[PDB]
Write a protein that binds this ligand. Structure first.
Ligand SMILES: [Zn+2]
Ligand SMILES: [Zn+2]
Ligand SMILES: [Zn+2]
Lengths: 171, 159, 530, 45, 102, 271, 107, 98, 84
C-alpha cells in the first residue's frame, strides 16, 4: 500500500531570493509545500526520498514581473487507501456508532453495523469499549480491518470499513 | 499542485471505474508507471517496515547534508515540524522486521503484482485460506503460497 | 488574484459539439422566448437570457459565481430543438457524405476490395483522402453485397435547405442522422473525420447551444426603454419556430402540414448562423434590416478575426506635426497637455522613491507630476479625488503612474506605415503649444510634411518594452536603411539650400559672427580656428 | 424604404454652409454611379 | 522569375538588394513549382487559425472543427490572436536564471 | 506570404514549418545594412594591365619588387622558395579573374560586406606612411597573412564537412575581393603598408566582417516583403512612357497564364 | 530508354511499371534535340547516394519534407532520371557569394 | 477613443524584431482572464473567485483547471464559434510533439 | 533533449535581439526591487544599472537558443562576446 511515485512541482520564486545558495531555498520551500500534502489523486505525500540530488533544471523568468518558474522533479513516499484493501491500525476513538482506527496517516471508522452482531457497544466503561462473547475492544487494542469505501477530503483522506468478514478484528 | 510523470491529454470526454483489490488501482498506479528519466519502470510496492526503512534512511542522509525516541528526535530537526510522526510510530509499531537484510531477504524472496508482494509482507498470515482472503486478488495465482507464508514467520525478526 | 495556475495555450483542438455535451454544459433550460419582465416587472424571467446565464444591471448575481459584468465571461445555455436540423455551413459535406455512403444500412460504397479505393484509402491527408474518396463513391449507386442490402442509392441534389434525390421516383430525404449514426467508426475515419472531436453525425444539430449576454449584449436607452441585440432575436425567432412545431406534434397533427412548419425552423437556424446564402430569401428583420448572422461578425476585415484580433485600437495620442529646427534629430516635442494625459507605471524603488513621492504630491495637474498610485492590494488610488490626495507616503513595491517626462522612449509614427522606419522611438520633450514637434532630417522616413499631416504616438509600458524601443528602434540606429544599403535621412530644404551658399569661395564671415556661429555648435571645443 | 435598400444613397445631402462659395458650388454639383469616365473629355468644354 | 521581378523594380530607377527579391522568388519556387502569392497559393500550403485570418475566414474554421484540426500555435498569427509572445526574433528563445552563477 | 520567415540559429532561412527556404540568408548570411558597392578589380581591364599589377617575379631584373619598396628587396631577389609562394598567389588571382567572368557582363561593381577601400585608408593616416622609405614584410608576411585571415571570416560554424563546405561556398566572392586588395604588389607598391599597418587592416577586416553577418532572429520575410512592395507604392499604374511596372508585378505575383505581352528574345548561334 | 518519334500508343506504355525492380523511361524525339541542361539559366544538379542524403538530413536536422522539392516530371529531373525519394544538390553562380549550394528532393 | 494599432503598424514592429513591445494587443487594449478546463478545453469553468470553488460539471471537475490571459476579442471569437457549434479547445500542453 | 557545452555551433556573439532583451529583462528585474551585482556608482534608472551589469558581465542569465528541429544551445551572458 505504501508507494514511491515520481512526482514534480512548480514554484514561482521572487527575485529577492536570487542569491548564491538558491538551490537551497527552492528545496526547502519544496518540502514546505509537499511533505504533508494530500490529494485523492496522489494520496498522502509523507516523505521526499534522496534529498541531496533533487532536480531543479533551469527555471524560466516570467515576463510581467521578475520571478523564475522552476519545475522541480523529485520522487517521494506516499500512501493512499484503496477499497477492499486490508490493513490494521491502533483503535483511536470509540462511540456508540462504532470505533475509529488509525492506519498510518489515516483514520478509518467501523460502524456498529459493520461488526459481528454478538459484539455490543459498552455503556458506562472507562475507557468506553465493546464486548464480545470473548473479545473486548478499547482505545489501545490493535485491530485488522478491511476498507469498504473511501472518501477524499480537504488535506486528509478518510474512509470506512468492516470486520464482519473472517480473519479480521483483534490479534 | 504537483503532477506525476503520466501526462495524458484529457480531451473533453468521465471514465474512472471504482477502486478495488481487484488489482484495479487508480490510473496513477498502473503496473506500468513512467520513470523520471523517461524510462519504463514497474510500480513500487512498499510493505510496512520496508517503508519504515526508506523513511529512516532519507531522514538521515538528510540530517547529514543539513549539517520510538530515536526517531522522534531525527524528526524535530529534518521534518517540517504531524502526518509523518504518525506514519512513523504506526510504521514502527507494526513494522514486521529490523535489519536491512532481514528486509532484503523478504524481497529477494517474494518477488505477483506489486501490491501483493507487499501486502503479503506487511500482513501477518498463516493459512492460504487466510492470505487468499485478505489478499483476494491472489486466489488462482499460486497453489495453496503456504510455504512462503511460513518462510516469513521464520524470518520474522524478534521484538 | 485567481488561485488557479497560469498557463499559455500551446495547442488548439477543433471539433463539433456533441448534443449530449451542450446539454451537459448548459446552465439554462431556456424554454421561454421573451427577455424578463415578470409581467412588466423588470428582472429576467427564468425563461430567456439569465435563466441563470450571465447578467446585466451591475448585479454580481449570476449563479452566485458573482463577479458582476466584468470578470464573468459568459455562461452558455441550450435549447432542445423539436426535430434535427442542418448546420447551415456543413450542408455541403453532409451531402457529399451521403453521396459516399449507403442508406438503410450506412456503410462505405467501396472497400479495400476495389483497387482504386485502396489507393485513396492510403492517402494520408484528412482532407485529400475525403477528397479522393468522394470522387469515387459519387458514381456507384448499388450497395453491392461483404456488407449487404444492395438497395439502390439515390442521386442527391441541393434545393435551398433540403437534400433530395431520385431512385425516376422522387423523395425528400428527411432519416439522414440515423444513417450517419450507423456509419462505422473506421469509416468516420475513412472520410475526413475524428471519432473523438468530431463525428460525421454532429454536423446535424439536435440541441442548440445558446450563447450568453457578453456575446449578444443589450443596449437599454436609460431604464424604461427596450434595446436588444440582433442575435438575441433570431434566437427568439428560432425559439418560437420550435414551440409551435412541438404544439403540432402533440395535438391534431396534420402530418403533412407539420413539415411545412419544420422547414421554417431549419431556416431560422440557417439564418442565426448564416444569413448570406444561395436561395436568396435574405431573411430581413422588421424594417428591412438584413440581420447580421454569426458568420457575418467574422468575415475578414471589420470582422473579429481581421478586425479585432490581427489589429485593434490601442496609451496613445495623435495631433498635427510641424518641424522644429532646434530639436536633436531623435527628439519629438510633445504638447504639455498630452504628457499630462499619458502615464507610465514606474514601480517604487529606493532610488526613485524620493522623486516619485514628489511627483505624486504634485498631482495630475502640475506638469512634472503624476496621476495614479497602485498599492500591492490590486486596487487604484485616483490622485485627483481621493481624500488622501496629497497625503500618501509610498511603499517600495507599489507602482505609480507618472506623467511622461523628457527622455522617455516612445514610438512615433506616420501611416501609411510601409517602412521599418514608419515607426521610430524618440526622446520625449514636453513643450508648449498643441503639436508634435519633430526634426526635419527625420522627415522623409515617415514621409511627412506640415500641410496638416497628423502623427500617432505610442507609449511603452514595461522596463524592457522601453529598452526594446531604445535599443532597436531609436532614430539613430535607423540612419542606414537596409532596403537600399544607404542612409535614408539627409539634410532637407533650408539647411541644404543654405549649406551650399555658405560653402562657395565667395562666402566670407567676420569675427563677430564666426563667434556666434561657433557658439551654436554645442560640442565646440572652445577654440576659435586660425 | 421597406426591405428595399437596393436604392442609391447620395441623392439629397446636407447643404454646405462653411462659406458662400461653398454653398454655390454644392448646388451646382453632379454625380455619376460607378479609368476612362473620370477623364476630362473634349465634350466637357 | 527573379530576373523578371528585378527588371520591374529596376525599370523604375529604384534599387533593392538581391536578397529581397530572391527570398520572394525562392518562396514561390521551393514547393516544387510556381506557387502564386495568392489565395490560391501560399495561403493553401501546410501552414487553421492562421489561414483563417485572410479571405475564407469562417469556412476555414468550419471545415477545421469538421475534421478536428490541431493547431501547433507555431504561427506568428496564432499567437497574436491568442495574446502570447510569438516565436519572433526576440521570442525565438527562452531566458533562464542560472542559480549556479547567481 | 513571408511573415513567418526568419533567420535561424543555424543560419537557415525557414518558416513556421521548418521548411528551408534558403540555407544561408541571401546566399551569404550577410545583413544588407552592413554592405556597400565595391569594385572587384581582378575582373576588369586588359590581360596586359592586369599582370603589371599583381604579377611579381623574384626571378627577374624587371619584374621584381624594387628594393625601394620592401626592406629585403635585394636579399630577396632570386629566392626560389619564395617565388613559389608567389606563384600559389599569382596562380590564384588568375583562377579568380576567370571565375568572375558569374558576371558575364564584366560589371565589376557589387554590394559586398566590409568596405576594404576605406579600412585601408584608415591605416593610411593612423600610422602616417610615406611614399618613400620601404616597408618591412617578409613575402611570407603578406601572402601567408592573407591566408590566415580567410580562415577566420566564418559565417556558418558547424563541426562536420557539409557545413564546412557551405562555409567556403557562401564566402568565396568576398575572398576574391580580399585577395584583389591584398596582393603583395599592391600592398607594397600602391599602399606602402608597414608590418604594423598590415596586422591592423587584417585584424579589422576580420572584426568588421563578423559584425556584418546576419543575426538569428532577424524577421527576414516581412522585411524583404516590404523592401519589395515599398518601391512599388512609388510607381505609376501606367504602362506607358512591353507590359511593365505596377500591373506587371501584379501579373507576376499572380503567376498569370496569359500575360498581355508574352514576347520572346532569341540570340543567334555562336558564330 | 525508348525514343518514340511522334508518339506511343495508350495501349502500349500501359506496360511500363510491369517489370520491377527494373524501371523504364520514355522520351519524345522533338524534345531531346537540344540538351536542356546546356541552357544558361540551367544550373548544375547532382544525385545523391542514400548515404550523401541520409547525411544532408542529419547535418541540417531536416525532416525530409522540410527540404525544397523538385517535380518528377521536371525537365532536369527526367534528364538525370530521378525517382520519388532521391535528392539533388544544385550548385549555381551567385552575385552575392559566388556559389550557393541548394538541394531539392524529388516528390 | 484610442488610436488603432492596425495591421501595418503590426508588421513594422515585427520587422524591428520588437517582440515584446508588440506583445504589449494585450496590455494596451483587450487582455482578460478566462478559466479553461484541463479536459474539455473550454471557457466553461464556474470559477467563484473566493471560496476557490472552480468546477465545470458536465466534465465534472474541480481539480484540473487553468487560468489564461487572452484578448477578450478572442475570448469572444470562441464563445462565438461555439454558438455556431464549432469547438475551439484550448490546451495548455503540447501532446502532438515535433 | 540537450546538447553538450561541447559541439556547440551557434554564434559566439550576442544577437542584437539577445542583448536588447537581456538588458530588457534584467532592467525590469532590477525595477522589481531585485538584487544588483555591481556598484550603482550613483545610478538609479534600472536600464542603466543593467547596462553596467552587462559591461562587467555579471548578469546571471542564460540564453537557451532553439533550433528549428526543437533542440537548443545554452550560453551565459558572461560567455557570449558582446561586440555590437
Ligand atoms: Zn458567471
Ligand atoms: Zn447498405
Ligand atoms: Zn472539459
Amino acid at each position: 500500500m505504501f508507494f514511491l511515485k515520481d512526482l514534480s512541482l512548480i514554484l514561482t520564486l521572487h527575485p529577492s531570493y536570487f542569491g548564491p545558495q538558491m538551490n537551497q531555498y527552492l528545496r526547502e520551500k519544496l518540502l514546505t509545500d509537499v511533505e504533508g500534502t494530500c490529494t485523492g489523486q496522489f494520496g498522502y505525500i509523507v516523505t521526499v526520498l534522496d534529498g541531496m540530488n533533487i532536480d531543479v533544471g533551469k527555471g524560466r523568468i516570467i515576463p510581467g514581473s521578475g520571478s523564475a518558474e522552476f519545475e522541480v522533479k523529485y520522487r517521494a513516499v506516499v500512501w493512499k487507501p484503496f477499497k477492499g484493501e486490508v490493513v490494521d491500525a491502533i483503535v483511536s476513538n470509540v462511540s456508540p456508532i462504532g470505533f475509529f482506527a488509525d492506519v498510518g496517516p489515516l483514520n478509518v471508522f467501523v460502524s456498529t453495523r459493520l461488526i459481528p452482531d454478538n459484539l455490543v457497544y459498552n455503556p458506562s466503561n472507562s475507557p468506553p469499549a465493546y464486548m464480545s462473547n470473548d473479545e473486548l475492544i478499547t482505545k489501545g487494542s490493535k485491530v485488522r480491518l478491511k476498507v469498504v469505501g473511501t472518501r477524499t477530503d480537504v488535506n486528509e483522506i478518510y474512509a470506512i470499513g468492516s470486520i464482519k468478514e473472517d480473519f479480521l478484528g483483534a490479534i | 499542485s504537483t503532477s506525476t510523470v503520466g501526462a495524458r491529454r484529457r480531451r473533453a470526454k468521465v471514465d474512472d471505474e471504482e477502486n478495488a483489490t481487484l488489482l484495479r488501482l487508480g490510473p496513477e498506479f498502473a503496473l506500468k508507471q513512467y520513470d523520471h528519466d523517461g524510462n519504463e519502470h514497474d510500480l513500487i510496492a512498499l510493505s510496512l517496515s520496508e517503508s519504515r526503512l526508506l523513511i529512516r534512511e532519507a531522514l538521515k542522509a538528510r540530517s547529514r547534508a543539513r549539517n520510538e525516541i530515536d526517531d522522534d528526535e531525527l524528526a524535530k530537526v529534518t521534518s517540517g515540524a504531524g502526518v509523518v510522526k504518525k506514519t512513523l510510530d504506526y510504521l514502527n509499531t507494526f513494522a514486521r522486521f529490523k535489519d536491512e537484510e532481514t528486509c532484503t531477504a523478504v524481497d529477494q524472496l517474494l518477488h505477483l503484482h506489486p501490491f501483493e508482494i507487499a501486502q503479503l509482507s506487511s500482513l501477518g498470515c498463516e493459512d492460504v485460506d487466510e492470505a487468499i482472503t485478505l489478499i483476494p486478488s491472489l486466489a488462482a495465482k499460486k497453489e495453496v503460497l503456504q510455504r512462503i507464508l511460513d518462510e516469513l514467520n521464520r524470518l520474522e525478526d524478534p521484538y | 488574484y485567481s488561485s488557479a495556475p497560469l498557463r499559455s495555450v500551446k495547442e488548439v483542438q477543433f471539433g463539433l459539439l456533441s448534443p449530449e455535451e451542450i446539454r451537459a454544459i448548459s446552465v439554462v433550460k431556456i424554454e421561454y422566448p421573451e427577455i424578463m419582465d415578470e409581467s412588466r416587472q423588470r428582472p429576467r424571467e427564468g425563461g430567456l437570457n439569465d435563466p441563470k446565464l450571465g447578467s446585466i444591471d451591475r448585479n454580481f448575481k449570476c449563479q452566485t459565481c458573482g463577479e458582476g459584468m466584468a470578470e464573468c465571461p459568459g455562461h452558455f445555455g441550450h435549447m432542445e430543438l423539436a426535430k434535427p436540423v442542418f448546420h447551415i455551413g456543413f450542408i455541403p459535406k453532409i451531402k457529399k457524405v451521403c453521396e459516399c455512403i449507403c442508406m438503410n444500412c450506412g456503410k462505405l460504397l467501396l472497400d479495400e476490395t476495389n483497387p482504386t479505393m485502396a489507393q485513396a484509402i492510403r492517402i494520408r491527408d484528412p482532407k485529400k483522402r475525403f477528397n479522393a474518396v468522394w470522387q469515387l463513391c459519387k458514381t456507384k449507386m448499388v450497395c453491392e453485397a461483404r456488407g449487404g442490402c444492395g438497395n439502390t442509392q439515390p442521386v442527391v441534389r441541393k434545393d435551398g435547405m433540403k437534400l433530395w434525390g431520385t431512385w425516376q421516383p422522387e423523395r425528400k430525404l428527411l432519416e439522414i442522422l440515423n444513417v450517419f449514426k450507423h456509419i462505422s467508426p473506421e469509416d468516420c475515419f475513412r472520410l475526413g473525420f475524428n471519432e473523438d472531436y468530431a463525428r460525421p453525425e454532429w454536423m446535424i444539430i439536435t440541441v442548440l447551444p445558446v450563447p450568453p449576454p457578453q456575446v449578444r449584449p443589450s443596449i437599454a436607452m436609460d431604464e424604461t426603454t427596450q434595446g436588444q441585440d440582433d442575435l438575441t432575436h433570431k434566437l427568439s425567432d428560432i425559439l418560437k419556430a420550435n414551440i409551435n412545431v412541438q404544439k403540432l406534434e402533440m395535438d391534431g397533427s396534420p402530418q403533412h402540414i407539420i413539415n411545412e412548419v419544420e422547414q421554417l425552423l431549419q431556416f431560422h437556424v440557417a439564418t442565426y448562423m448564416d444569413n448570406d446564402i444561395a436561395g436568396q430569401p435574405q431573411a430581413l428583420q422588421k424594417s428591412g434590416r438584413p440581420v447580421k448572422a454569426i458568420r457575418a461578425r467574422l468575415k475578414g476585415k471589420e470582422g473579429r478575426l481581421r478586425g479585432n484580433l490581427m489589429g485593434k485600437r490601442v496609451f496613445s495620442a495623435r495631433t498635427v506635426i510641424s518641424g522644429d529646427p532646434n530639436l536633436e534629430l531623435d527628439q519629438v516635442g510633445v504638447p504639455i497637455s498630452i504628457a499630462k494625459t499619458l502615464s507610465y507605471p514606474e514601480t517604487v524603488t529606493q532610488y526613485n522613491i524620493h522623486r516619485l513621492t514628489e511627483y505624486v504630491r504634485n498631482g495630475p495637474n502640475e506638469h512634472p507630476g503624476a496621476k495614479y498610485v497602485i498599492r500591492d492590494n490590486g486596487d487604484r488610488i485616483d490622485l485627483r479625488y481621493h481624500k488622501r490626495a496629497g497625503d500618501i507616503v509610498l511603499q517600495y513595491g507599489w507602482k505609480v503612474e507618472r506623467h511622461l517626462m523628457d527622455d522617455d522612449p516612445v514610438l512615433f509614427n506616420r501611416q501609411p506605415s510601409l517602412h521599418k522606419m514608419s515607426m521610430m522611438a524618440h526622446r520625449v520633450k514636453v513643450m508648449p503649444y498643441s503639436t508634435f514637434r519633430l526634426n526635419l532630417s527625420v522627415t522623409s522616413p515617415y514621409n511627412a510634411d506640415f500641410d496638416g499631416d497628423e502623427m500617432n504616438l505610442h507609449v511603452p509600458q514595461s522596463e524592457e518594452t522601453r529598452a526594446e524601443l531604445s535599443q532597436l528602434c531609436a532614430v539613430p540606429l535607423q540612419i542606414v536603411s537596409p532596403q537600399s544599403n544607404k542612409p535614408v535621412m539627409g539634410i532637407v530644404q533650408d539647411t541644404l539650400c543654405g549649406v551650399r551658399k555658405m560653402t562657395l569661395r565667395d562666402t566670407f564671415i567676420e569675427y563677430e559672427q564666426v563667434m556666434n556661429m561657433l557658439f551654436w555648435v554645442p560640442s565646440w571645443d572652445g577654440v576659435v580656428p586660425q | 424604404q421597406k426591405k428595399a435598400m437596393s436604392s442609391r444613397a447620395g441623392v439629397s445631402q446636407v447643404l454646405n454652409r462653411y462659406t458662400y462659395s461653398s454653398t454655390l458650388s454644392h448646388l451646382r454639383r453632379t454625380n455619376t454611379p460607378i479609368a476612362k469616365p473620370r477623364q476630362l473629355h473634349n465634350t466637357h468644354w | 522569375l527573379y530576373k523578371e521581378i528585378l527588371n520591374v523594380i529596376a525599370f523604375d530607377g529604384s534599387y533593392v538588394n538581391y536578397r529581397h527579391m530572391a527570398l520572394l522568388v525562392d518562396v514561390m519556387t521551393s514547393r516544387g513549382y510556381l506557387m502564386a502569392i495568392t489565395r490560391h497559393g501560399i495561403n493553401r500550403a501546410d501552414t487553421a487559425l492562421m489561414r483563417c485570418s485572410f479571405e475564407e475566414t469562417v469556412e476555414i474554421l468550419f471545415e477545421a472543427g469538421a475534421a478536428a484540426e490541431l493547431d501547433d500555435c507555431r504561427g506568428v498569427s496564432e499567437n497574436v490572436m491568442l495574446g502570447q509572445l510569438a516565436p519572433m526574433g526576440t521570442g525565438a528563445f527562452d531566458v533562464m536564471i542560472d542559480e549556479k552563477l547567481l | 506570404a513571408l511573415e513567418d520567415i526568419m533567420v535561424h540559429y543555424d543560419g537557415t532561412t525557414r518558416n513556421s514549418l521548418g521548411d528551408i527556404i534558403q540555407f544561408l540568408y541571401g546566399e551569404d548570411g550577410l545583413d544588407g545594412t552592413q554592405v556597400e558597392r565595391q569594385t572587384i578589380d581582378t575582373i576588369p581591364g586588359s590581360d596586359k594591365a592586369f599582370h603589371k599589377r599583381y604579377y611579381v617575379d623574384l626571378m627577374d631584373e624587371k619584374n621584381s619588387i624594387k628594393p625601394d619598396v620592401i626592406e629585403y628587396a635585394a636579399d630577396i631577389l632570386g629566392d626560389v622558395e619564395l617565388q613559389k609562394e608567389l606563384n600559389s598567389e599569382y596562380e590564384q588571382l588568375v583562377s579568380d579573374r576567370k571565375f568572375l567572368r558569374v558576371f558575364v557582363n564584366g560589371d565589376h561593381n557589387w554590394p559586398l560586406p566590409v568596405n576594404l577601400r576605406r579600412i585601408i585608408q584608415n591605416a593610411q593616416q593612423i600610422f602616417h606612411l610615406d611614399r618613400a622609405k620601404a616597408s618591412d614584410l617578409t613575402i611570407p608576411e603578406i601572402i601567408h597573412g592573407v591566408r590566415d585571415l580567410c580562415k577566420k571570416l566564418f559565417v556558418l560554424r558547424g563541426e562536420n564537412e557539409l557545413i564546412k563546405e557551405a562555409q567556403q561556398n557562401a564566402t568565396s566572392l568576398f575572398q576574391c575581393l580580399v585577395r584583389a586588395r591584398l596582393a603583395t604588389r599592391r600592398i607594397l607598391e600602391e599602399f606602402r603598408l608597414n608590418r604594423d599597418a598590415f596586422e591592423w587592416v587584417l585584424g579589422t577586416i576580420e572584426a568588421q566582417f563578423q559584425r556584418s553577418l546576419v543575426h538569428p532572429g532577424e524577421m527576414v520575410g516581412v522585411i524583404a516583403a516590404q523592401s519589395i512592395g515599398e518601391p512599388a507604392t512609388q510607381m505609376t499604374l501606367n504602362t506607358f512612357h512591353v507590359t511593365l511596372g505596377v500591373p506587371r508585378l501584379k501579373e507576376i505575383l499572380n503567376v498569370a497564364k496569359n500575360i498581355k505581352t508574352p514576347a520572346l528574345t532569341v540570340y543567334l548561334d555562336r558564330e | 530508354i525508348f525514343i518514340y518519334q511522334n508518339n506511343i500508343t495508350p495501349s502500349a506504355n500501359k506496360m511500363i511499371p510491369t517489370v520491377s525492380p527494373a524501371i523504364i523511361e520514355t522520351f519524345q524525339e522533338s524534345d531531346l534535340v537540344v540538351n536542356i541542361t546546356h541552357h544558361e539559366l540551367v544550373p548544375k544538379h547532382i544525385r545523391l547516394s542514400d548515404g550523401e542524403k541520409s547525411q544532408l538530413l542529419q547535418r541540417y536536422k531536416l525532416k525530409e519534407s522540410q527540404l525544397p522539392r523538385i517535380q518528377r516530371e521536371d525537365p532536369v529531373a527526367r534528364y538525370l532520371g530521378l525517382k520519388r525519394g532521391q535528392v539533388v544538390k544544385i550548385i549555381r553562380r551567385s552575385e552575392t557569394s559566388g556559389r550557393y549550394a541548394s538541394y531539392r528532393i524529388c516528390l | 477613443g484610442g488610436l488603432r494599432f492596425g495591421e501595418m503598424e503590426r508588421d513594422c514592429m515585427i520587422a524591428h524584431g520588437a517582440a515584446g513591445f508588440l506583445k504589449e494587443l494585450m496590455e494596451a487594449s483587450d487582455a482578460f482572464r478566462v478559466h479553461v478546463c484541463g479536459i474539455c478545453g473550454l471557457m466553461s469553468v464556474i470559477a467563484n473567485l473566493k471560496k476557490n470553488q472552480f468546477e465545470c460539471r458536465s466534465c465534472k471537475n474541480k481539480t484540473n483547471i487553468y487560468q489564461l490571459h487572452i484578448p477578450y476579442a478572442a475570448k469572444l471569437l470562441f464563445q462565438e464559434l461555439m454558438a455556431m457549434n464549432i469547438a475551439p479547445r484550448l490546451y495548455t500542453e503540447r501532446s502532438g510533439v515535433s | 533533449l540537450a546538447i553538450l557545452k561541447e559541439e556547440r555551433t551557434t554564434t559566439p556573439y550576442l544577437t542584437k535581439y539577445e542583448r536588447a532583451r537581456i538588458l530588457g529583462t534584467r532592467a525590469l528585474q532590477i525595477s522589481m526591487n531585485a538584487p544588483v551585482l555591481v556598484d550603482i556608482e550613483g545610478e538609479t534608472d534600472p536600464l542603466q544599472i543593467a547596462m553596467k551589469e552587462l559591461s562587467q558581465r555579471k548578469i546571471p542569465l542564460v540564453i537557451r537558443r532553439y533550433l528549428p528541429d526543437g533542440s537548443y544551445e545554452d550560453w551565459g551572458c558572461d560567455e557570449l562576446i558582446v561586440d555590437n
